[PDB]
Design a protein around this nucleic acid. Sequence first.
RNA 1: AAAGAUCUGGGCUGUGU
RNA 2: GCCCAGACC
RNA 3: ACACAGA
RNA 4: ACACAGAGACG
Length: 1826
Amino acid sequence: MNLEVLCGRINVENGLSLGEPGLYDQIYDRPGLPDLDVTVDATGVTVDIGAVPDSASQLGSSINAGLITIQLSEAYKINHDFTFSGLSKTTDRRLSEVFPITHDGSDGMTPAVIHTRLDGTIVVVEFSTTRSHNIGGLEAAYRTKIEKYRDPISRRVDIMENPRVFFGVIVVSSGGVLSNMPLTQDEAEELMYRFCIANEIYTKARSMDADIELQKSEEELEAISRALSFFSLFEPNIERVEGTFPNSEIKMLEQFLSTPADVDFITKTLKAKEVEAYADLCDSHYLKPEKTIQERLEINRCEAIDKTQDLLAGLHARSNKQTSLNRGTVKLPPWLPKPSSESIDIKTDSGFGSLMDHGAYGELWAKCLLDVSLGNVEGVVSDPAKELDIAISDDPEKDTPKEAKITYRRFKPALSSSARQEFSLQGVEGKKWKRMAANQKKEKESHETLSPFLDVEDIGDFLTFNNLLTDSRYGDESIQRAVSILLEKASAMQDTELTHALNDSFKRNLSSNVVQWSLWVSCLAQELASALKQHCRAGEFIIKKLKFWPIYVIIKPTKSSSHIFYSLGIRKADVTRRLTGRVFSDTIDAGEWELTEFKSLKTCKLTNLVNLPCTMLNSIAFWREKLGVAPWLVRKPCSELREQVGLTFLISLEDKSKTEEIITLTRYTQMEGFVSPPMLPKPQKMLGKLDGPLRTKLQVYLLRKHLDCMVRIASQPFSLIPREGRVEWGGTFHAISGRSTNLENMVNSWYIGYYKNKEESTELNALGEMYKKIVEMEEDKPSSPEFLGWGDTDSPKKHEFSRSFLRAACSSLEREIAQRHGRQWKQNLEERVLREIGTKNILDLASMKATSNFSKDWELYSEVQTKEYHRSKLLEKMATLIEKGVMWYIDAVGQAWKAVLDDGCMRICLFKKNQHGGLREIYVMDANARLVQFGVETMARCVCELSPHETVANPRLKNSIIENHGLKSARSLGPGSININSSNDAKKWNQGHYTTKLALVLCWFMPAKFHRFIWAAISMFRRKKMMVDLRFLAHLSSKSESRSSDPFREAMTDAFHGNRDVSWMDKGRTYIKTETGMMQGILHFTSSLLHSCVQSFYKSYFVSKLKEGYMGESISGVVDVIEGSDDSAIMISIRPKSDMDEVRSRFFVANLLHSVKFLNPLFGIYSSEKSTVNTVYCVEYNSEFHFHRHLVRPTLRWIAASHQISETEALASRQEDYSNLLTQCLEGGASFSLTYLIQCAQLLHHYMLLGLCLHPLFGTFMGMLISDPDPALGFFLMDNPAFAGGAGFRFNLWRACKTTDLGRKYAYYFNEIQGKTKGDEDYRALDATSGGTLSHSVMVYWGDRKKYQALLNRMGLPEDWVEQIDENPGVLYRRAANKKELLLKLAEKVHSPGVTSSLSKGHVVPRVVAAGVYLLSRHCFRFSSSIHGRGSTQKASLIKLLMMSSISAMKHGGSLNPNQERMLFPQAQEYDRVCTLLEEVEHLTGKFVVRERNIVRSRIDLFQEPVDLRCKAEDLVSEVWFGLKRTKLGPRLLKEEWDKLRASFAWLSTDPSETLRDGPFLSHVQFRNFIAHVDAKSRSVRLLGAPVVTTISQVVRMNFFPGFSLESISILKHVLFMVLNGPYTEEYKLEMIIEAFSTLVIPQPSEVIRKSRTMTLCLLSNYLSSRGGSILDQIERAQSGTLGGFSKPQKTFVRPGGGVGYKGKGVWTGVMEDTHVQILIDGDGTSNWLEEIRLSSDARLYDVIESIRRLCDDLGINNRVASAYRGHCMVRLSGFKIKPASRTDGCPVRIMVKMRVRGDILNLSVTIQEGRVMNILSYRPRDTDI
RNA sequence: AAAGAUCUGGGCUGUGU
RNA sequence: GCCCAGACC
RNA sequence: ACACAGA
RNA sequence: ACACAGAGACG
Ligand SMILES: O=c1ccn([C@@H]2O[C@H](COP(=O)(O)NP(=O)(O)OP(=O)(O)O)[C@@H](O)[C@H]2O)c(=O)[nH]1
Ligand SMILES: [Mg+2]
Ligand SMILES: [Mg+2]
Ligand SMILES: [Mg+2]
């Protein structure tokens, strides 16, 4: 590389330009490393570098062989010196000899390079190296090198004339280069290679003599020393290990590391597997006897048809063989009553007698209404006047009844025995009627599965033809009016035309039939959730009415884990409309009434019904966007929209696991359509996963449609369409409906099953399947151990593997690791591992996760049957270990291993994961096994960190390998390359891994001193005792005989009862014993290491095979591999050069990507049928779908989770949670308008959770909210429709403060907080007070504090932990040293609000849903007394809090002043900049465009963190107070940074006690928390779109809607853009601009209070015409342009040469945007600086400040000099940034004509002083003007 | 009830009388 | 760092 | 000591 | 009505 070319290829502008940091990955093929011969003879270090081994990439050609000497005192800098030798042969250059002499302390600072071009451009280049392995280390080094030199260079820039400085940085690591230089890829690769040799030299020189390196920290040495002592003195008693655990002989390990791999066996096995794979490929894809593709596709169709017919027949043979029944998919009636006025009364008169003679349900309803209309049911008529009196009660606890709720709306009907029988058939008091014959027969029939040939055609007709999307004409009813009022009040913040259009679209969606139905269904679900706690005696029912609808419900509650029964009733006159379709359950005709049979719902099933309206609204909006229909368009629905919305409806309502599982499998069924020749699609491979019981009509319908999809795929693959430079696919369709659609629509339809609720509760009879999943794998254990680590076999069975192939895979991975990290990688790995193990603390293991309490005392069921098993928290065990005195993980793991070995097993307990896509069992260890597992997983993570393609330990490799395959193939093969990929998954990954293989793989890469620990610690995995549920085992114990078609159920019964002997269960035991398999994710990283080894072997083998060729000549190819845990992908790129060679090369590559299935069992890995093999131009990895240059992300996945019912306790934290959910929908691929509609649904959800459909006082509450829109009191804030979900909740809170009456309330809160002293009541620090603190002032608690208090009483922590921390503050800044500091840190952890709220709350979603009946009127909210004031009691209702705010906080006059706005919202200036950028899109105007299909992830940075400190204030305070070298600065820079900290906070001192007694903080923990957050935030949103002050504008324009662009004078703009960018000179350009302003006509200007380019053009149109008169008056009235002049000119002086300087105290006075501005400036002969800013008003401070920045930009005045004025102002300006008025490092801000063309700049200006020109108007042409 | 991990974002019968 | 949420294994 | 180097 | 190739719940 060359420094001159690299520095001369930079485009530099005036002033200092940092640029943008670019990242370079190690992509290109690398030659072998040269030979190194390092000697240390104490006369320096002599390295004998040999020649680079022969290759052809021109990489490594900068390394010259021969002797090199590097002195001992210069040998600690080798990595820096050798890497950059050739880029910069020199060493350093001071700033004194290139820059003007400043008199700071920085004149002696030496950046690596200071280059100077011929014109005068200066490039300051800094070099850096890091030995880290992640991007974080590169970012840290880049940031510290920028921080060290940015400020002094800028100070020198101030005093230069015509300066152009860049200041680039290059940071080099092993696998990355981070630099803002325009480096080529080859230069970065060369730097990485040179760094590899340099680090090899450095490691060798350190190994030979230990004084080359530098003295490292005491803590690092102690960590390394304790780790070394542990691993040297650890004796696991391997003889006892062998006698205790199966196959634990260490002679296996000794043989594995010393016996080389059997080369002949490997070659013979590889040939045999090759011919077996070829035979399988030829037989199963019909390649011989050489037919055409049509005939082979027909044979594929016939095979698929036959196999699906076998499936259907086998499923029918075990069913009840009924071809017709009446069983509704939807258990709710299709009623659409017109909504009525708010009422929850049960007023009923007259007709009861006709109801009596209409069956059992008519009898029940008539008796209920008769009892209601006689006064014997309490609370039938609500009183929203006494409830208000309770709500406004100044004295709770005395005027709220306690015992009224006992008889609330409860009636006890005297039903006949026939009616009780009928109701018991539905489960209503069904346990008592269990032995009656009808109940027995119904129970017997309930277990029978359904036939696949069942008539299900009402479902298909409903899906194609329904009235779900018809307008209901209910748009002016009460629920609509309430939601509309709340939405319009929220939208008054951004009351524009876009807001109105999107609100109208939302309200049209809200007025559809399905949403109106979902609204009352959600209200019914909320009433049932309320009835959960409303206990009923025997025979007692509850009668309720829905608030907005004439619907009555009779409810029978049970135990809260058991069922809720309900019956519905309406008047037939009240049924205005109905939902069409035959998917609904039949109702009952009862004369005047329509009734509903008793249906059941559990707690988990309620959620989907609660969220149903938001689900349906979001589905309608999403599928309208995906069909290309704009939100602002009225259009009748097509068949596809009806099908999608109806399918979502049915999936949400059925809420069953098999239903969503069938839909989930369609993804793997339909991915076979991308399989390329010479292979055919085989979607019939999924037929094994569709075998299972069918229990609903929808399951039958979905299975049949899935099988039709499978037959369709098997006969016709998706077609390739390459047209211009992209690859498109044709023939895609929805799997369920069958209708043709886009690729993205098919991918999204693969996730419709996600609408089923994950959080179901599993029943006891469903719990045995888990045990079944564990047993047959253990039953497949080989009876002989010869192929479990000892020998070699070519035909391994289950759990078996061959030693030679495992060793060869380890060798291959070791070769790749030695290529990347050098030949001394293991030496550095040892130091890394010892550091990690010795540093790690016991409190680091004190997590919030559960642990197993299973032990020897729980093993025998006869001693346990009366007990209840409970898991513990790991925090308890770790706290017990800390109290006893253990402080390091080293001192605990020895005792943990001793306890495990004495136990002889590992103790596990089980549970079932709540997941989509099927069944997964989950294992929980006890604390001893966790302590042992932690060390081996640490070592495995450290090894996986070194792998060049393992993605679990290297997150960037999730993407970089896939998207760098194109560059690598383009370099190696040229253009026009064919890419063939395979995406592979493994079958039962954790269950198939015998842990001896994992131990051998891990011990291959670790140094021998760890081997004794690794072999023993994994050995305990070969005897695992797994506790089963005690209730399941209790029901099993009472049934010694088995009546089941499942063999496992009988086997388990006999094993527990002793009737048979099996290896996994003994008689009368509570556990299953298992030897095979790791557990789920327990040995995650070592299994990733094994898979990395295997795929490294595959890559090497594929490369060798491609080099061999098919008939002798090599195939040119590029092979890439990527690995997860069991997930893998292989990418092979070829260029065949002709048509005839292309067929042969593709056949060869298909054969290579067909034998992975056959080579995997040699490593104990089994290919899953979820693997998609041999697909051209497309690859999938961890559900990331790369379809050539189209990255497809399933947006429906995140849209389905956008309205989670939050468990949070603060009211505004609900809106923060909603915003966090919204951002993920935005990043998942949704447009901005879709995100806004999703937020409208979130608003509806939020007000439902506040009691919109429940509380009779919600109207009063809403009326109070209109006059007080406080988010802390429940007001939902809506986003700007053009940028929805992109800014966050704090930005919207700042907008609400700046716009609504929340500013007055926050100003009052600020004044009340500022007025108190430290000893005062309700005092809090104003410095630690932000807008988020004020919004978090109202809370409601959901958990039980008694559980948390009992947990505290079992831990023994000191009560005066705050005082003991105050005695020793240093405990809050570094690790503990003794028992005392660790106990203090533990007590600090457990008393944190997050830990307390986590250990208090369990599952509280039903309580949150049922709180809607009492949040408004009952005193359950705790409020901050520092903010809301002392109340009469500690708790209040929401209406009470609104009145308290209405009498105190709303009386305060005046909004926030700029100082308060700056303190509460530190990022307010960036907020205002973005908000100004957002107000140019206020109208729905634009054009429909082409979507262009090129889609990629791209990050958008906004609200960027300003430049204040070099380091974090945490580290600076730590270093100054306690001597910890947490920063990277010398004493001069450390003192300089401490000066800026003290400038920010004058009370800060070098003594912690002085700061504690002089600051605003009562305790020192509070100061630690405050100093943790001095730097506020930095927000970046990762959009998914076109391959990109400017970028925000583009994404706002191009992402409002897919295929839409949101936009005489514009013709003038189009002319001027080509004029100012054209190849002309100033003379020729000046003519036709005047000509264009003399031809075209421009509207006359007006008064605007924002920046408009149009009226700026109008002003120059009038200037060139001189119509009105003086141009200055026109500009003054139009209020666009800086006007004014110097009221005190500076003394003008001649600089040495040709420059002109100023020295006096000049004063500028003028107007900038309707504001009188007086600027005071000074000078010293080198620069000029601001002294004071005087403004007559602060209404538009931010715009005025930006105008001052532009005014000082061209006048050469800098805001870098601090003023000595210590008086009072409103704000201070430092670097043209607004600061709080208490700051002491900026200037105070206090209250009180010719036209030119610069470079592509068009300005109107006037002279101000001699040798000084200032602008008035500027217009910059933009690329969007054409 | 909620294991081992990776990313990204954020935070620091209270019952309807 | 700690806690929370979502997605992924 | 200043100025360098930085898992 | 929920669960389930009849292992449970319906107090
Ligand atoms: O929630 C999870 C998901 C995945 N994993 C770990 O990731 C492995 C692969 O995750 P997987 O989703 O492929 N399931 P797998 O066990 O392979 O069976 P199959 O359905 O046939 O593919 C699993 O074997 C676990 O070890 C977890 O530990 N926890
Ligand atoms: Mg340097
Ligand atoms: Mg798998
Ligand atoms: Mg997987």
